[PDB]
Amino acid sequence: KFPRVKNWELGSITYDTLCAQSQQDGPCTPRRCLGSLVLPRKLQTRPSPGPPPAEQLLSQARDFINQYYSSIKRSGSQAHEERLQEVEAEVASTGTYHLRESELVFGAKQAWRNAPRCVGRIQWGKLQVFDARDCSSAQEMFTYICNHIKYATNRGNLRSAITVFPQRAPGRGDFRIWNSQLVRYAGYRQQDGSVRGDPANVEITELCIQHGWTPGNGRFDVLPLLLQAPDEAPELFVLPPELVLEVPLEHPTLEWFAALGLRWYALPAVSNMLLEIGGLEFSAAPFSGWYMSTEIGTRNLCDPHRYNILEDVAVCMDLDTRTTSSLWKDKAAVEINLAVLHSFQLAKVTIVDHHAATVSFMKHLDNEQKARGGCPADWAWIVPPISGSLTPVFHQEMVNYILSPAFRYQPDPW
Amino acid sequence: GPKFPRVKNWELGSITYDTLCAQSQQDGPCTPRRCLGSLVLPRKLQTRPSPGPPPAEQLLSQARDFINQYYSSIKRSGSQAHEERLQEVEAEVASTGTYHLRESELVFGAKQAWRNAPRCVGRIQWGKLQVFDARDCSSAQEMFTYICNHIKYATNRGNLRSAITVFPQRAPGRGDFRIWNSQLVRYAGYRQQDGSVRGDPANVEITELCIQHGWTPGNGRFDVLPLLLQAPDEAPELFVLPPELVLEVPLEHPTLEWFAALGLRWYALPAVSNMLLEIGGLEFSAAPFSGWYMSTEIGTRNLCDPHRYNILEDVAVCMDLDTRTTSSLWKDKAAVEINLAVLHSFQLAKVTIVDHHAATVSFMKHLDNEQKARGGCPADWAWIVPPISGSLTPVFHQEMVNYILSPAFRYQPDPW
Ligand code: HEM
Numbered sequence: 001k002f003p004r005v006k007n008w009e010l011g012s013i014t015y016d017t018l019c020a021q022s023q024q025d026g027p028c029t030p031r032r033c034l035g036s037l038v039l040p041r042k043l044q045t046r047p048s049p050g051p052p053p054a055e056q057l058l059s060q061a062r063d064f065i066n067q068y069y070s071s072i073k074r075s076g077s078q079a080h081e082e083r084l085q086e087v088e089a090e091v092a093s094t095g096t097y098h099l100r101e102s103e104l105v106f107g108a109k110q111a112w113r114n115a116p117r118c119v120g121r122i123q124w125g126k127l128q129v130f131d132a133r134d135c136s137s138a139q140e141m142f143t144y145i146c147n148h149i150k151y152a153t154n155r156g157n158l159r160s161a162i163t164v165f166p167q168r169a170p171g172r173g174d175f176r177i178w179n180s181q182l183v184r185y186a187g188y189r190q191q192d193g194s195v196r197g198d199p200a201n202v203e204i205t206e207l208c209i210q211h212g213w214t215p216g217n218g219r220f221d222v223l224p225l226l227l228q229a230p231d232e233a234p235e236l237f238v239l240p241p242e243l244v245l246e247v248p249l250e251h252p253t254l255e256w257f258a259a260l261g262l263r264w265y266a267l268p269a270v271s272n273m274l275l276e277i278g279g280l281e282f283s284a285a286p287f288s289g290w291y292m293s294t295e296i297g298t299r300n301l302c303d304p305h306r307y308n309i310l311e312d313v314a315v316c317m318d319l320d321t322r323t324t325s326s327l328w329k330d331k332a333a334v335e336i337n338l339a340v341l342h343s344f345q346l347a348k349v350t351i352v353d354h355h356a357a358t359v360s361f362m363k364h365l366d367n368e369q370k371a372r373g374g375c376p377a378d379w380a381w382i383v384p385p386i387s388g389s390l391t392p393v394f395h396q397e398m399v400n401y402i403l404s405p406a407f408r409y410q411p412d413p414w
Numbered sequence: 415g416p417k418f419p420r421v422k423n424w425e426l427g428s429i430t431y432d433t434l435c436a437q438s439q440q441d442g443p444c445t446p447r448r449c450l451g452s453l454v455l456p457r458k459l460q461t462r463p464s465p466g467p468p469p470a471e472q473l474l475s476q477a478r479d480f481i482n483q484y485y486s487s488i489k490r491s492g493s494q495a496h497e498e499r500l501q502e503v504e505a506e507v508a509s510t511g512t513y514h515l516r517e518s519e520l521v522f523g524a525k526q527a528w529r530n531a532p533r534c535v536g537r538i539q540w541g542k543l544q545v546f547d548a549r550d551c552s553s554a555q556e557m558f559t560y561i562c563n564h565i566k567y568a569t570n571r572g573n574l575r576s577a578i579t580v581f582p583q584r585a586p587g588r589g590d591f592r593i594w595n596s597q598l599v600r601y602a603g604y605r606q607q608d609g610s611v612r613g614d615p616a617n618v619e620i621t622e623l624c625i626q627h628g629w630t631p632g633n634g635r636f637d638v639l640p641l642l643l644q645a646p647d648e649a650p651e652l653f654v655l656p657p658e659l660v661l662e663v664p665l666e667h668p669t670l671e672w673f674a675a676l677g678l679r680w681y682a683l684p685a686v687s688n689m690l691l692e693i694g695g696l697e698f699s700a701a702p703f704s705g706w707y708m709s710t711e712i713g714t715r716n717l718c719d720p721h722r723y724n725i726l727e728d729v730a731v732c733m734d735l736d737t738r739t740t741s742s743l744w745k746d747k748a749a750v751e752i753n754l755a756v757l758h759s760f761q762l763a764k765v766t767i768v769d770h771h772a773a774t775v776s777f778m779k780h781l782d783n784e785q786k787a788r789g790g791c792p793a794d795w796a797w798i799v800p801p802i803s804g805s806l807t808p809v810f811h812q813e814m815v816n817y818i819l820s821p822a823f824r825y826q827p828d829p830w
């Protein structure tokens with residue numbers, strides 16, 4: 001029934017009762033655990049050409065409204081009762097409903113709070129929510145996105161934010177941001193299949209070019225945005241360079257590191273995920289916080305299928321790349337992460353290292369145990385890509401499950 | 415597409431389907447509602463002491479399954495020998511309540527158990543395992559002799575050889591053969607006045623049990639514990655391993671000359687001894703097994719875990735790093751050098767060891783061989799990816815499917 005959760009470093013034990021509130025199934029079964037899988041095989045967000053079963057939508061809506069009124073300590077009040085009736089009334093007549101700004105705000109923060117793979121949830125209560133539901137064109141989307149970026153960046157003192165565009169509607173196309181993040185470096189396929197820039201963005205880079213974008217030939221060329229209004233071909237929009245803050249990478253002691261010409265943007269803003277609140281779906285709701293240094297230093301720069309700079313840094317450090325046992329990869333990885341941290345701190349841009357970040361997450365886990373009796377967490381994503389066991393979360397057992405409001409993956413619009 | 419889990423490798427973009435999981439005959443801890451994959455000891459396999467004889471009906475089904483696996487492995491499925499063997503087993507269980515395995519069946523089962531272990535990254539070596547049959551063992555003293563022979567053969571002066579020694583299976587109402595220690599080689603953990611621990615905090619209980627049983631304790635940081643061996647229905651007897659048999663490696667760093675002064679060291683033979691080997695329903699409560707270390711087990715986990723030797727700060731101070739702020743990555747720097755120290759020292763002493771890069775690369779090969787041979791491979795991601803430099807190794811980017819296959823190694827309650 002209720003899982004016993006143990007921390008092997010401290011010997012402490014807790015019981016997760018929150019998981020009982022889950023109404024959505026994951027990929028696992030008693031026969032086999034599919035926890036390491038990144039994307040769902042079925043838990044997707046299928047098309048919306050038809051109205052979602054009123055019975056189903058209604059229950060999810062009631063449950064959300066119930067959550068909302070509990071949050072403001074007004075459960076069972078007059079307003080609570082009348083709000084439910086409003087929702088009932090709108091669904092019965094139109095097959096859908098709409099959230100009030102205050103409810104939307106509460107919903108966005110809860111979705112973040114419930115995200116199992118996010119290590120920075122201790123900040124969940126501090127999120128600037130921009131209501132962009134009164135958007136009717138890709139151009140309007142572009143303006144909203146620029147205001148989000150200006151606000152979130154705040155000249156280096158990053159502030160968590162989310163912009164919410166119109167919800168999905170039956171039989172009508174979705175508002176969508178084709179790019180996976182608001183800021184991405186182009187990936188150009190060249191010569192023998194090799195790639196100049198970010199290999200992860202090859203497909204999107206090409207799509208932009210096909211829609212009239214004049215490509216560059218650099219390793220860090222900020223991509224343009226392909227914003228799409230309902231049932232309309234996406235449109236191309238270039239981001240004002242002065243809005244895209246970047247940080248040149250250099251090393252605290254290694255003089256030559258700067259010569260490598262490496263750099264990375266300050267703002268991590270996911271834009272391809274779907275936000276679900278009370279049965280309503282927001283196909284375009286970009287959110288951003290700040291980077292944890294390992295995302296850049298380890299994954300973006302060192303992943304084999306990414307910038308894969310490990311060997312270069314290794315040769316520069318004149319390390320023995322002849323054998324694995326010299327641990328040259330481990331050594332370069334650490335300096336590269338040090339460079340990222342040093343650089344961001346120098347440029348006065350917000351960032352958090354994996355040690356500070358995971359310590360804060362352990363606090364969050366404790367806060368959530370008292371508040372809700374548990375905290376859904378995906379161990380594989382919570383533990384950093386380097387120095388895993390050197391952080392507290394490694395020794396902490398975790399229970400993973402789906403709670404709503406929630407951020408979910410959705411099909412690529414093309 | 416195929417009605418089986420779709421497994422993706424994100425580095426190579428390659429895809430495979432696991433059909434082997436369809437063979438699993440035992441449920442794990444997860445459900446569609448929540449994933450409990452990260453739990454170390456989920457009350458599942460946990461072979462809790464089941465005294466009273468097992469349901470002849472359940473044992474038989476398991477035995478029939480194992481025998482089918484065996485004859486399939488020798489390509490004689492459906493043969494006369496296969497059906498006659500099935501008849502033996504059912505008849506032996508009918509009259510005695512249990513049965514026994516033929517020699518080659520034990521060898522096959524022992525290797526399959528290793529092959530089936532989801533948390534073992536060294537399974538590419540599964541086919542090469544020396545199976546010592548010790549099912550004739552009748553005394554705790556004899557257990558000691560067998561164990562000493564195992565250590566000698568496995569250590570082989572540094573050129574380690576994988577091996578397992580199987581003691582008599584569990585019998586109805588009869589006491590179990592048991593090795594109280596978690597490993598054949600373990601360092602003592604002495605509780606102190608201030609409340610701290612000298613030695614390995616992981617072995618405080620076993621250390622205290624050895625004392626309660628007449629062991630005169632030492633006071634070092636690396637004192638090899640004696641063995642508490644238990645024969646059926648008898649109190650455990652204490653045995654001290656001859657020092658000449660326990661090969662150890664002093665740790666030194668290739669460039670940091672002061673590292674050797676730290677006086678750190680580790681033993682060469684990793685021999686798990688508290689796990690239960692289950693084959694066709696039969697239970698081998700005492701079946702110690704050993705291979706060789708993957709360097710991160712010693713350098714990262716044993717030496718740097720907070721609840722273990724916890725030497726991170728000491729080494730960082732010696733490296734003169736800023737241990738007052740996380741952003742200096744002092745923990746990451748010290749960990750790397752400590753791991754390098756382990757690899758270097760073992761190589762120097764000519765003692766077999768494999769670094770996490772080599773090991774994970776070889777496991778990827780194993781996954782490929784197994785995809786072709788069985789249509790899948792049960793793997794526990796959290797345990798396969800190394801404790802340091804995770805995404806720098808290939809296994810990190812490889813999705814994995816975890817499930818229980820039998821024969822298998824399982825945890826079992828402590829005898830005390
Ligand atoms: C304030 C700083 C924040 C930091 C330090 C942070 C850090 C992280 C990290 C490291 C990951 C995993 C990345 C990976 O391993 O690929 C992650 C995932 C995630 N975070 Fe956060 N996060 C923060 C704020 C936010 C905000 C504001 C939201 C939403 C409003 C959010 C929503 C999520 C979600 C949904 C995921 C999973 C995305 C996926 O499945 O790909 N995060 N976060």
Ligand code: HEM
Binds near residue numbers: 536
């Ligand atoms: C040949 C060298 C081998 C290497 C390098 C190796 C390495 C490993 C490693 C790194 C672990 C996980 C350690 C941890 O994170 O705590 C492990 C677990 C395991 N290995 Fe292997 N292994 C090898 C041989 C063996 C042998 C010979 C057997 C048995 C016949 C075996 C059975 C297992 C089992 C059952 C586990 C899991 C035990 C547990 O859950 O605590 N391994 N192995």
Ligand SMILES: [Zn+2]
Binds near residue numbers: 028029032035448449
């Ligand atoms: Zn699972």
